[PDB]
Amino acid sequence: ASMGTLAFDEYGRPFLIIKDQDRKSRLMGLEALKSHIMAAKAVANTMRTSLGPNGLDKMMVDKDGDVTVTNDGATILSMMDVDHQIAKLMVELSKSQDDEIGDGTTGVVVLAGALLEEAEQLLDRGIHPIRIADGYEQAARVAIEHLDKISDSVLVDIKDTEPLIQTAKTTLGSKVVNSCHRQMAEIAVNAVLTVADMERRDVDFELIKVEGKVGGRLEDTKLIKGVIVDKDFSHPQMPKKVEDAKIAILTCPFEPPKPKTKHKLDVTSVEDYKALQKYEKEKFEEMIQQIKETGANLAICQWGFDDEANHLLLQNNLPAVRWVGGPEIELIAIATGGRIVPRFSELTAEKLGFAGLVQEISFGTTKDKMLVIEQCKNSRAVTIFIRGGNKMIIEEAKRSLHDALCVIRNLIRDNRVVYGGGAAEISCALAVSQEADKCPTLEQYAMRAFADALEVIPMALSENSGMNPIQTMTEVRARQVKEMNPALGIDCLHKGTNDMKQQHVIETLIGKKQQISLATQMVRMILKIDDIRKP
Amino acid sequence: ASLSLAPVNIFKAGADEERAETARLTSFIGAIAIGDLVKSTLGPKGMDKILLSSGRDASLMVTNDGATILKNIGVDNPAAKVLVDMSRVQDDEVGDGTTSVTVLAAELLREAESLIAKKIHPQTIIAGWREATKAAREALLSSAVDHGSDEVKFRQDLMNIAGTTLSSKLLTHHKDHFTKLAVEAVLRLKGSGNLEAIHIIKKLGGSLADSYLDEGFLLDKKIGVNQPKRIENAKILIANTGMDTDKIKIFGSRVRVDSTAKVAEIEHAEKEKMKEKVERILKHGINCFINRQLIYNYPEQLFGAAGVMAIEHADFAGVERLALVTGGEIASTFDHPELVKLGSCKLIEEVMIGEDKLIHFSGVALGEACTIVLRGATQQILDEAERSLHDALCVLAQTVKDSRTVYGGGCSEMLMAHAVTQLANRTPGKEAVAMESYAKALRMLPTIIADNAGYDSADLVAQLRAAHSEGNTTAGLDMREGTIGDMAILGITESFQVKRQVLLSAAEAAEVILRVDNIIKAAPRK
């Protein structure tokens, strides 16, 4: 069942077809499908334990020994060192879900694993895999239509952020920041809403600078309606706090000008040397005077500067910073409402950015100094400063906040939501099963397999919360059938009720639709593969 | 089916994976090993460890600091790595509490292992620990006492805090003198948190009791050749100029002439420019000149002929410290002598310390920069003394920034543990068991403190628990004889910030490690 076709002749002479055909394996027919299904099942069963509020974290170690404790499914699978090609396909599935939506990167893996598990027993009964894929696609269309039917709209206005805060809380519940849950959700909602082109357009994440510094406490995480900079004032004797600052943003180093072209300046006499020295001194004084003429109280440079400029700035009561990064320059000028000026001669009063407070922040006994610019008038750029007891919690909070921001961005794109906790999955499974009964017999099996694979998310939630999966799932489904209420889900937090609408477990419709679509397409693609030719 | 126990192989060569019970076992073993390694260095009777390096240097390091111990070890258990990073971050935030936070996290994880063995879901343990941490934080905050108003009471509190911090370290032999030294050094900062302004100079030879805080400042640089070696009523000019073959910053410039006479004239012009630079510096009316960069032979000769000291190569820290201690301004241009403030001090001279010569500043004007000389029998003693003094200075700076203080000697731990037990006694479910385990770890901390001293720890902890439940909220361990006493009367106090950070960081790291059910290792490079 390998080595291609090992015959070597019909007569006795050499029979060589493919280069190095004696060191190449090959899997054909149903055996390849069984291997792929088993591999995907293993990956999905590994990943399903990190699902829901009661899900447990996974603790990755890379090839350099660095430790990354995380719950993000896409992050977990990305750092996994797999060799099987189907495992790589599942990792890419998670990456696709993270790219398009940013949330639900774990549910897709579990859904694909359940779909392939059902397809295994369907193939065991003699159904062609393409028939299974077609049935899965039909059931996915039915489920997507049902999700659109049972969807609910929310108000995305800035005045009423309660639905947005509830959605962000639902997203963050599974993450470790559920201790600061409400604060993290509120700051994520405010960060997204501040930097967002409000006519239902995109949200640019380059306007959100998520920065984390160790120390402090997780509750100290805050949203700064401005820019926080990892630099400090150039001269140590400059004041540490500037109020009502008028910031001048420059990309010209405070050095005497230098032409780009290959140039030689010839000195031919003592008079020429004196003229050159005087020229340098007057250029320093002239650039400082030009900066001070606009009335700016603070200067920010990108390329650094030398000692004479430093002492002139200190002597003229002009605090300044140097070597600010280009992205940081852009963010500062966006937040302060000022323009970026490439040389001192182009500096005017109208190009100065205004900031209410510019301060230098200390971090205990660590010698590190970081600059913060805030209290702007109408700043269109925000930064998130995360504090924690170790770098692992900093990274985990970073990815959790990214998930929350992505969820609110999806809410910006579309305002339709569905109620999680497995309620949407149970309702979709019920709709799929109902549609199967009104269908010819052959694809009924594929449709019912799709429904059973959909019904794995509530079972995983029940198992992770300690409840009996089958009993709880059956009771919830029976209650959903009895009274028309697709919001009944799995009470993971044991609040006493199954009504997710009353429990405020809210998820975006786009997220569920993308989950189902991606899982269906990848299950079809995996099912269609029947030959493996590893070297 | 598992990722590793499957008929198909899904991993690269060398990749590993440990499921629920195996991963929990590895994490708990690593955490307990780290906790048992770092402990026995805790409390007034804690001992030191020797850290032999396996590298080519093979540097020797004896220390009592938990963060130092955890930093310089080869750790491969990832949970142990988490605890090590916790200790490092705790050291960065505040000077003290590394051993306490590491031991607290280890005890919490041991209790978590016991609870898991008792068939309790880890999420229940985490929720119980969250509630317990909230209760303990509230109790510790309520127990805080502030003496920032009264100056003499605050000085007494600072002295007590420095003594408590230095009790465990090697400096406990001369704790009284070292406490006075550290308190004076911190108070000389005039409220600034700049710990870099306090310079520690380690000179071999002499007893540890020979260490002192200089009334002025000490520099480890050299004076020029012909310049005076002693100046009275010095006028200090701190600079950051080149003064080394000072060239015009037009890097495209060059000398292109048709005779050597022109080259000689240009060289004379260069020397004249340097002379004019020195004259402009001298026009300020100074007796001593400190420059961050090097000073070449020509300006040194000019200063010597002018009778002005020219100290060179004082790095950024040096010039900053001189500016803080004398009040001068770090200048780089001298076209406005009247806009530059000049530092001042009563006397500058050269002092003999051991076998090295240092520049001594006496009668400094501002004096907001301390220099401390450490004398020890061995280099290891000097390093440990420097680390202990740094811990004391960090804790004192934190206390100056935030004046709230809490009682030590196990009083705070037992108080928060009593609060946690009170909350657990009125809570239904297994969360009560989890919170009881949290309180048990909190009790275990002073239990380890008493174990390190050889006393009857069980009886002492029982007495402490009885006193804290009865209402004696200031009862703590009296390590002088091995009984319990009043920490307020005895005078064992700690910064509230340090204790709160220890508690919160330990609980957070325990929660982080406890949430893990699977460890996946990628194939290493080696």
Partner: peptide
């Protein structure tokens, strides 16, 4: 690393 004028790592 880089900018010996200030003695700090830039960019």
């Amino acid at each position: 690393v880089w900018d010996m004028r200030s003695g700090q790592c830039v960019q």
